[model samples]
Every structure is written in structure tokens, then in C-alpha cells.
Target: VYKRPVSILVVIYAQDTKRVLMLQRRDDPDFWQSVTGSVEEGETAPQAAMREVKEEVTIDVVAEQLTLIDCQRTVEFEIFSHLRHRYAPGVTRNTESWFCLALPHERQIVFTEHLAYKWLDAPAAAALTKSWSNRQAIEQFVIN
Candidate 1:
């Protein structure tokens, strides 16, 4: 079996919780989501996560602060169509390690791989993205 693991999708937010950053995939127009990329070969998950942040946003997100959420195995869907080439032949089932990157500072984001970008509130950002689970996750993110 081609053990193509799930990629890291970093949902970056402002320190003040006023805005949440999102990007629209260049290949998939209007499909706004977080800064996500596959882990490079021979790279650790955290390293890969930081790499994606730098590559996509042109900023350094402290790897130490990148809180690792539970790894989620996603069900196959049409969403995999555009990214199928990344995995081996007939190899499906991705184990993605979701991460959250919250910042109290304004980090400049440059669209290197994405087409457009936005910094919306939780509701607006959730509406733009198709990840219902992730949206709910964000809404459920409150200090205990």
C-alpha cells in the first residue's frame, strides 16, 4: 500500500481573534481554506508544517507554537480529484495532522501558491471553506 500520509493544514489566526487567514487554491478557484501543503520527503511533520507556513505566507510561524491536533483520517471524496496525482496509483485514505497557528501579531501573507487570500472572522471564514468539520472545530475553539 502506498502510505501517502495526510498533509498539514495550518489554520492561522490573529492574536486578537478578530480575523482568521485563509487562501484560495490556485488550481481550485474560490475554494478558500487554510495554508496547507504536503510534507516533503524525509521531513518531519512539524518541519513540514513550518515549511508550508513560510512558503505560503512568507512568514515564520514558530514551530514550537504550532499546536498539533489529533490526526484525522479523512474519507475519500471528490476533493481528492485535484490532488490525486500526489499519491500513488489507487492509493487513497489520507491521514492528515491538523494544526492551529494563532498569532497576536499581524503577519504579512504573500500569495505564492494561492490565487487570492482573506482574513475573515470565524463565521465568514467558515462559510468560505468546504471543511465543515474544520469550521466546527474553529467555532469550538474556546478556552476552558
Candidate 2:
């Protein structure tokens, strides 16, 4: 199935400790990022954010009653050539919306798709992310 050009980036962090959760992709172990996924047809950006949080780390935003704050920011970037196949032909760019979820403390991450996970401070987390949008989200929302 072709993916929607719209996506969501969710930065999960510990409110008490001010640490952010970063996950190493199973497909590319060297590339680490926060919760991110395409927004499916008919789903709102917030819905996509919640779904990604659960699918990536097994965290139920609603059930756990976690705070998912929409950063109200969006960025458009050219899709990586390798991943462009996932979208329709001629779709070379994607729009990514930003969000942040705060946990009282760092919770046990139940990794479902990532190879590994780490709870790092905002600066370290931003440095570890490959995507500029991901780094911007952490820097803007978490760090400052």
C-alpha cells in the first residue's frame, strides 16, 4: 500500500527526569529516532501519533492516560530516495507534524519494532536522531 505523504513525529520524554526516549530502527540499527509513522487515510495527525507511540513502544496513550501534546509544528522535506517507493509516484516530499508525550518517569519500553532503546537527555537525543525534523522537535519542545 502506498503511504500517505503526511506523517507524525512523537517525542516521548520523562517529565520528572527530562530525558527523552530514542529508538534504534530494526532495519537500520545506526539510525535512531523517536516515535514516527505515516498518517493513514482518514486518521488525524493526533491519531497517527497515538498509534505510532503504541506500535513502536507498546505505550497506550489513552489507556495509560499519558499527555500527548501537539507541538503544532510541521515541516516539509524531500523523502529519501530509498523510501520514496513507499509513497505514490511523483510524491517526492512529505509533511511531518510534531507531537510530544510526557511520562511522569521513564517507563519500561516494550520494544516491538526497534532493535534497541535509550532514555537520553534532550541534547544527546537530538544528536542521535538522523532526521532534522526529529532533532528540531526535541530541541524545540524538550530542550528549549
User: What lDDT score is found at residue 140 in candidate 1?
Assistant: 53
Alpha-carbon deviation at 106 in model 1, angstroms: 3.7
Query: What tens digits encode model 2's per-residue C-alpha lDDT throughout 59-85?
Result: 898888878999989999998777788
> In candidate 1, what are the lDDT values of residues 7-76, reduced to their tens digit?
6767677767657887888777857888777766789777877788889887665654645443342323
Return the top candidate by TM-score: 2
Which segments of candidate 2 are over 4 A away from where they belong? none
RMSD of 1: 4.0
lDDT of 1 at 5: 49
Please give the TM-score that candidate 2 achieves against the real structure. 0.94
Clash totals, every prediction: 2, 0
In model 1, the worst 10-residue window by lDDT is 70-79
